[model samples]
Target: SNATYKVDGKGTYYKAESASFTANYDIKTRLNGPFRSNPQSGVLHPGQTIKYDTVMKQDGHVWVVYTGYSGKRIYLPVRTWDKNSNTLGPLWGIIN
Candidate 1:
């Protein structure tokens, strides 16, 4: 079965078990300025999440890609452009 997801201005992420659910965001369907991935940052691991909650003037369309159980990565589009953007970064999992 497909996994479920939540829609938040921060980011869209799913649990490790919910990796089956994957989706893509279309600029025409969902996005404001433009959406691009951080190639240097690499892909987002399972059970991990990222967010984009910022908007100085007009919120910009930001997209985060993640790996789902489907054996492929999916894109979650959000709108933000504020100081919060600088606060967020790659969150590593705990060694424990």
Candidate 2:
């Protein structure tokens, strides 16, 4: 029995927008010579979620630092890691 049979049915392809989540925090530190320091002002812990309500500061000297801000803004993925059960590591092994 090497013949193929025809099967008609509905199919779907589901996928998430994000793969990993990130925690948000506000930081303000003094910069040293040649190096810009960014001290963590708010809470910054592992596995914690951060939602920014204001603009976040970047490293190095800023040409125009914006004022009048509050809270934090963070972007995180909705889910972490692969959802499949037969998948292997991201670097090693084959994913089926």
Candidate 3:
């Protein structure tokens, strides 16, 4: 079975306009629905990189917002949001 995710909003969203993240591991990009836990749009495999528009914290993780196919938002999890979390960070590098 899969784990559930929680999204929390805290600060400046507009300040984070754009950036790119390089995958440190195989990360999944999600195309979310009005429903919760939508299936992944695709895989952002290790060493690969993609541009992101915004940064959001959810699922105890920090996700990067990417360009979407249907003008909707796409998301890629870049790292663990909590310091004590066991989950490995998803990215090797980020360009702001």
TM-score of 1: 0.24
Residue range with the least summed lDDT across 10 consecutive positions in model 1: 21-30
Task: Tell me each candidate's TM-score.
Answer: 0.24, 0.21, 0.63
Cα lDDT tens digits, model 1, 22-83, are 22222221223223432232343445444323212222433433443543444443333343
Q: Choose 1 or 3, whichever is better by lDDT.
A: 3
The alpha-carbon RMSD values of the candidates against the true structure, listed in the order shown, are 14.4, 17.8, 7.4
Cα lDDT of all candidates, in order?
A: 0.32, 0.23, 0.60
The numbered model that scores best in TM-score is: 3
Q: Write out the backbone clash pairs for model 1.
A: 19-69, 54-81, 54-82, 55-81, 55-82
As a TM-score, model 2 comes out at: 0.21
Model 3: residue 48 alpha-carbon error in angstroms: 1.4
Candidate 3 lDDT score at position 38:
71
Backbone clashes in model 2, listed as residue pairs: 27-41, 51-72, 52-72, 52-73, 52-74, 53-72
By TM-score, how accurate is candidate 3? 0.63
Over 1-96, each residue of candidate 3 has an lDDT whose tens digit, in order, gives 012333335331222547677776776677862112777787778778788766665566666777776777777766665535534554445554
